[PDB]
Every structure is written in C-alpha cells, then in structure tokens.
Ligand binder design. Structure first.
Ligand SMILES: CCCCCCCCCCCC[C@H](C)C(=O)SCCNC(=O)CCNC(=O)[C@H](O)C(C)(C)COP(=O)(O)OP(=O)(O)OC[C@H]1O[C@@H](n2cnc3c(N)ncnc32)[C@H](O)[C@@H]1OP(=O)(O)O
Ligand SMILES: CCCCCCCCCCCC[C@H](C)C(=O)SCCNC(=O)CCNC(=O)[C@H](O)C(C)(C)COP(=O)(O)OP(=O)(O)OC[C@H]1O[C@@H](n2cnc3c(N)ncnc32)[C@H](O)[C@@H]1OP(=O)(O)O
Lengths: 354, 354
C-alpha cells in the first residue's frame, strides 16, 4: 500500500543493517524476498517472503540467479568477495539483469586495508571520531547502542543509495552498484560536528559541548523518584520558560551561556529537578515550549498520549513494534505483516516469472 | 555527477534535520536551491545555490511559488501550520505543481497533542524509550549527541520518504506529502531493540545488555596511555581471537556469556588492556578478526590508513569534511562544492524556466 508497492527486492539473509534496510523497503510496500540457508519470532523480519537455498550448490545458485534476474534491488551484507565466490557478484548479476541495483552493505567498505576485517558497530564508529565523542567526560566512551553505525549511518545510507539509484535508472535505463560502508555513512551522519569543529563550535573533549551533555540546558536530570527528565532548552525563550516552571529567578542564576559558571548553573538546576517526581515535571511543562520532556523507559512508551494518538506503535503478537516511517499522504503504508512460514522458492518464481 | 543529477530541490532554510537532508541530496548531484531570509562558513551548506526572499511579503511568496512550480522536491522544517499561514502549504503548492514531493521535517509530527510544542533531539528520543537506554547504568542517561533524532531517525527518514515518493511518481505521475517525524523515524531506527524486548533478548535496564556497554566483549577499555580501544567481539571465534591477542588463557576465564561473572571477566580484560598503550593494541590486532579497534578522536581520524585510502574525508577550506555517502559505481558523486555567495533568485528562475 506504500509508495514502494511494485518494487522487487532480493535480500540475502544477513545480520544488522542489511535486514533493517530490507524491512523498511517492505514497510513502504516493496515485494521483498529473503533467501536464507536451509516461522521467525524476529519482528524485524516483518514484511517478507522467506525462501531458502544452498547458494554453494549448483541448484541454489541457479534458483537465486533466476530470482535476481527478475528483481530491482539485491541486498547483500557479507564480507567483500563472498558473493563473488558464490557466482552472485555484481558482474554475474549483470549478465542476467543490468537493471539491478546491487546494494552492498558493509562496515569498512568494498576495498581498503580493513575491508576483509570482521567488526561490529562499535568498531566502525571507533575509527571515525564518533565513539570518542559519546558519553560523560570523566569516563570511557559509551556505545550509543548500535544506532549510529548499523542503522543511522548504515541501513539508512543503503536505503538512500538504493532509492537514489532507482531515480538514476529512470534515465540511464541501467542499475549499478551501491557500496554503503558504515564507516562512511556514519561520518556523513555526524557532518554537523565536522562543520562545527571547523568553526570553533565543537571540541574533541568528550562531554564538554552543546549537544553531548556538557551544557546544563541540554542534558537529563534525575527527579525525586529516581526517574529522569530530558532538558533541551537551547533557545533563550525556551530556556526562560524552563526556569519559570522550576520556580527559579533568572536574576539569581548565572547566565545561560556562561560556561565558566556551568557547574554552578547545573547544581541549581539539579536541586530544582530533584525536588519533584518525573511526572510532576511532565505535568508542569506539559504544553510549554520549555523543551522539558519525561525520559520514558521502553515499557512506558505505550502509555504516553502523543505516542498513542499518532499510532507510532502497533501491537504485534507479544509486544509493541514501531509503525512504518516516514508517513505518506496519498500512498500510505500498511500495518506490517508479521513473519510467516517459509515458502517454496519456485512459487515466487511463478509469481514473478523468472 | 551523482545519481541525483537532474533532481530539483527547493529548501526552505531551517536548522538540523532539514538542512542535512538537503545536503545529502545536493551531495548526490541534486540541484538544490535554498531560500533564506534577507557566504556561509557552515560546511553543511555545501552543494547549494542560496537565494533570498521575504516569504511574508507579496513578492517573496510569488517568487518562491515560481521556483516551487519548477521543482521536484520541497523541504520545510518549521512547526506545522507555518507554511500554511505563509501560503506555501501543501494545498497551495499543489495548485502550481502537483508533481511536487512536499517533504515536512518535524520532531513530533504534523498532528497530535505535542505537535505545536518546541523541542530538540533529546526531547524526541526521550518520549520513545531511546534516551533511557543510553549510558552507564549507575548514572543518568546521556545524549548520543543529536545523532539519533535529528539525523539517523530524522533527515535519513525524510530522505527515504523523498526518494520513495519519487519512485511512486514514476507511475502515478504525481507527488504527495511526506510527514517525517523524528519521534517515528527514531522508533523505526531502534526496531531491533523492540524486536528483542518481545523475545527476552533486551531489557529496559540501562547498561545491562549486549550492545549498550553491559557486555565485557562489546564496550571500550582504557589503555596504559589514557586512550581507548573498542572491543566488538560478539561471535565466539572473534572473541577467541581477541583473548589470543591478549595472551589470556580461556581455560582460566569465565565463559564469554556467563552474565553472572561478567564483572570478573571485565576486570581481567581491564587489567589486560591497561597494561599497554592504545597504539600497541592498535598494532597487536592488525588485520585480525578480534574486533578490537582504536578509539580515535576527530583530530586523529585523518592519520588512519583505512580512512585515508578510501577518501572518506576531503580537506575543504579550513578542515576535513566527510565525502558523500554511499558510493555509486557508475554515477559517482563529485567532491562537494563549497558554500558560495548568495545569488539572484531570478537567475535561478531563468535557469529553471520559472
Ligand atoms: C527477536 C530477535 C532479534 C534479532 C537480534 C539479533 C541479535 C543481535 C546482534 C546484533 C547484530 C548487530 C551487530 C552489533 C553489528 O554491529 S553489525 C556489523 C557486522 N558487520 C557487517 O555486517 C559488515 C559486513 N560483514 C562482515 O564483515 C562479515 O559478514 C561478519 C558479519 C563480520 C561475519 O563474518 P563471517 O561469519 O566470517 O561471514 P562472511 O565472511 O560474510 O562469509 C559468509 C559465508 O557464508 C556463506 N553463505 C552465505 N549465505 C549462504 C547460503 N544461503 N548458502 C550457502 N552459503 C552461504 C558465504 O559463501 C560465506 O562463505 P565463504 O565465502 O567464507 O566460504
Ligand atoms: C558551522 C555552523 C554550524 C551550525 C550549527 C547550528 C547550531 C547548533 C544547534 C543545534 C541544532 C540541532 C538541535 C539539537 C535540534 O534538535 S534541531 C530540531 C529542532 N526541531 C525541529 O526542527 C522540529 C520542527 N520545528 C520546530 O518545532 C520549530 O521550527 C522550532 C525549531 C522549535 C523553532 O521554533 P520557532 O522559532 O518558534 O519557529 P517556527 O515556530 O517554526 O516559526 C518560524 C517563523 O519564521 C517565519 N519565516 C520562516 N522563513 C521565513 C522567510 N524566508 N521570510 C519571512 N519569514 C519566515 C515563519 O513565517 C514563522 O513565523 P510564524 O508563522 O510563527 O509567525
């Protein structure tokens, strides 16, 4: 039902960014066929058809290629060379389908000294200054889950690459290869900090900047109940609204942007926030522009009115899952279809005509 | 030169996600025209033409609409209702160009109880369980800079919405509205943790999971020089390669996934890593699959061989900036054009035929 209805995607079963990319394509209405090794409880495998094949066997290769001959996009996330050795590399795929967008999802990219090296998110963002910038300044860096390498700088760039290549295809008639490396995507993801560093607006000192926790107006605060609020009152008029809700006199406080006095400012803000519960502040600044919000655990999200009203989540069997994003006014996306039983690869070939 | 060469984008100047989205379109070859209020050192504003109009004025509105009439995409990132009041809302734009992809970039979305409220990244990820999941367990949550709401769950979803809607326009001949809300995108960005929570594979206890710092094999360690390495050795063979490099006898350590003895495991690993400087480990895990990498500060990135050889960065005027991502084999993106002087809006309208 979404805008990608009609798009055919072959996904070679992998882990992390590749399956996430394929999910979003399916989310938006694509026809996604996932080939695995010979009913999943993994909600990420929503919006698929699962088929199986041994790609090291002559029959599996032949069946895979027939599928690929009829697809728009191929997603693979193995080490570079792996698809080549199977006979499913870009040059073999070209011979049967030169309209194909061949999307290669890696951490380190297709070439370079590290291209054959195992790794995970935390490694890809360790090499490009990202990790070093995350966490409190008095302690070692903390990983921002696998949100920045695997997804924000990984699958999301694979998706952009795929969709941009589909635009180009309109006039060239041809596909090509998209090399989406997490080490690259994540760097463009953090381009604002590269831009800020060049102008004296960001330092390499962890935890001492405007957006990393260093600013008392841009951080979390612990409340009376041991729960937290988030404060993001960057603009002076938002900051002023924040001080108001807390019952603090601005004249009695250091100026907002006097970094010399930030520890003094933070102590006053700490004392304020610590005097009531999280839900008290939630109520104080419910409709304000104070940029103060309650910090909800996953298990609490379902109770928040803005989350409910907008149907950001849906109940699948066993728990809430996020609905497709972003939203489309005319070709809206469906509620995702749960994972289903594996189906016969030949049946999909009939459906597609391979 | 990139795959988006030919695409026409009108960007209504704003902050954070919108300008980052426009940048990536520009990066990939789009013809992006930015309308600001009446030459930048913001490297984010690379790959543009900048023009000036007072949109509150009769003549300003008229010129903007003439530009929009010739564009493929419009990006705006103001509060919902703002463009409506200006007379550049979706209903007004449709009258002059129904092929327009109208891309609306917000935190809270177009509708809902919070939709008119101020906020910034830290607020958007505070409402949907993300923030609460970031940081050490013995402390309040830390913001993962503005990487998760503004960009990974923000501009990146706007971009997917834009390019998806363009694909759809191939066959419907028409555009539509993309409502990209950071509270939604970030939720889809963290779908893996929603999937895991449902199967008992992720807990709401901060700092106590596989990918958040709780696992001794997926975290940073401080070295003899006070600098850091990242360890990402999730798979047993990589973990084994890690211990081997450290000269620790496995027989003598707690099992990798015995959570009850994780603190004992961490302490042994801490002692090991602290015995030499970062560059030593740097060297020990050379081309190994041990998933151990050095944690480079921004200012060190330019010295790293894998970074150099792949040209992940380029020297603009004054500092390193990331090259376009992802990479395309046939229609490669150009090195970004630096920000240039504001130009005459009519010269753009002549160029485009408006
Ligand atoms: C409710 C549950 C939710 C689910 C939760 C899941 C669990 C959570 C875990 C989180 C995972 C996310 C983690 C944190 C990340 O950070 S992801 C980043 C990992 N890196 C990458 O993806 C970069 C690209 N990939 C790689 O570098 C490597 O694939 C790897 C991930 C390091 C693993 O290395 P390794 O296991 O040696 O695999 P590869 O070298 O790729 O070779 C794969 C071999 O398998 C074969 N193969 C594949 N498909 C088939 C098939 N259908 N039939 C037959 N064979 C198949 C290939 O031929 C290849 O074999 P060969 O070519 O070596 O002989
Ligand atoms: C090297 C330099 C680097 C540069 C770095 C920049 C500095 C770093 C700062 C950190 C930025 C990143 C932070 C962490 C973020 O999270 S950004 C995300 C902020 N949130 C959003 O974007 C969500 C959607 N937007 C909004 O909610 C709001 O726009 C906002 C950000 C809260 C700002 O609120 P506010 O100032 O009241 O603006 P709005 O309500 O949107 O109204 C805008 C008014 O301006 C007017 N306007 C606009 N363009 C023109 C024009 N060309 N000519 C004449 N007028 C113009 C509009 O008409 C509107 O007026 P009105 O309709 O309100 O009367």
């Amino acid at each position: 039902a979404g805008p990608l209805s009609g798009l055919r995607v072959v996904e070679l079963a992998g882990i992390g960014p590749g399956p996430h990319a394929a999910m979003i394509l399916g989310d938006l209405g694509a026809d996604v066929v996932r080939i695995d090794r010979p009913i999943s409880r993994d909600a990420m495998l929503r919006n698929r058809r699962i088929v199986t094949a041994d790609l090291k066997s002559d029959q599996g290769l032949e069946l895979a290629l027939k599928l690929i001959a009829k697809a728009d996009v191929l997603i693979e996330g193995y080490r570079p060379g792996v698809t080549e050795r199977l006979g499913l590399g870009p040059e073999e795929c070209a011979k049967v389908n030169d309209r194909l967008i061949y999307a290669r999802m890696t951490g380190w990219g297709q070439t370079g000294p590290r291209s054959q090296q195992a790794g995970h998110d935390i490694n890809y963002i360790s090499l490009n200054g990202i990790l070093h910038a995350i966490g409190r300044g008095d302690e070692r860096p903390v990983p921002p889950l696998n949100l920045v390498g695997d997804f924000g700088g990984g699958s999301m760039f694979l998706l952009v690459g795929i969709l941009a290549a589909l635009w180009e295809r309109q006039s060239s008639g041809k596909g090509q290869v998209v090399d989406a490396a997490m080490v690259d995507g994540s760097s463009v993801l953090i381009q604002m900090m590269w831009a800020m560093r060049a102008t004296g607006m960001w330092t390499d000192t962890r935890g001492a900047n405007m957006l990393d926790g260093g600013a008392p107006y841009y951080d979390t605060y612990e409340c009376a109940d041991g729960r937290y609020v988030a404060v993001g009152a960057i603009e002076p008029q938002f900051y002023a609204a924040m001080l108001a809700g807390l019952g603090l006199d601005a004249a009695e406080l250091p100026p907002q942007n006097d970094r010399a006095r930030w520890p003094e400012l933070r102590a006053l803000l700490t004392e304020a926030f610590a005097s009531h519960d999280r839900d008290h502040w939630g109520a104080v600044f419910a409709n304000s522009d104070a940029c103060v919000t309650p910090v909800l655990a996953f298990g609490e999200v379902h109770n928040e009115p803005h989350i409910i009203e907008r149907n950001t989540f849906y109940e699948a069997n066993g728990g809430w899952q996020p609905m497709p994003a972003p939203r489309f006014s005319r070709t809206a996306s469906s509620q995702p279809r749960p994972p289903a039983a594996t189906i016969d690869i030949e049946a999909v070939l009939t459906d597609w005509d391979g």
